[PDB]
């Protein structure tokens, strides 16, 4: 399980517990799905290489 | 008739909220019996059109 916290522009805060298998990475352009088990959205040091898009089935 | 309050008219405490939530989820699960799951329902809805002139 992964807990995700977001916040709206009016200060409302939303919390959602989502199973790990729901996450599917998108490509850099976010046009197409990104291949799981082989995808580099983290640089060598370990930080985000770009704004990563992830799709959740539910 | 079934009361919508499930016997808990007021959530004066959060334990009342928990009891109502548990009973409400069980009640809704029992109601949604004989109604297919999301995947099967979407499969039936998307593949509804079965009228094509030419097949392979």
């Amino acid at each position: 399980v992964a807990k995700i916290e977001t916040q709206s522009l009016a200060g409302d805060r939303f919390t959602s517990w989502v199973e790990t298998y729901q996450f599917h990475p998108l490509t850099q352009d976010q046009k197409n799905f990104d291949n799981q088990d082989n995808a580099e959205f983290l640089e060598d040091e370990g930080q985000l290489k770009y704004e990563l898009g992830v799709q959740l089935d539910n | 008739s079934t009361s919508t309050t499930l016997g808990l008219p007021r959530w004066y405490k959060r334990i009342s909220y928990y009891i109502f939530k548990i009973r409400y989820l069980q009640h809704t699960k029992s109601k949604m019996n004989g109604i297919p799951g999301s995947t099967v329902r979407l499969m039936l809805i998307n593949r509804h059109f079965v009228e094509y002139e030419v097949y392979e």
Partner: protein, 49 residues
């Protein structure tokens, strides 16, 4: 203790911990106090026998 003269149950209304400023604690919640065990009002926790 709520008394009944040989009847299995009685309607009981609870208004919580009554105070001097307001004569009632919470809203008048009714229930059917039955015979056999202790029973309590979940709104205020008052145990009825």
């Amino acid at each position: 203790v709520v008394f009944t003269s040989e009847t299995p149950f009685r309607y009981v209304g609870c208004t919580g911990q009554m105070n001097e400023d307001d004569y009632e604690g919470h809203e008048l919640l009714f229930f059917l106090l039955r015979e056999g065990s202790l029973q309590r009002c979940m709104g205020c926790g008052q145990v009825f026998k």
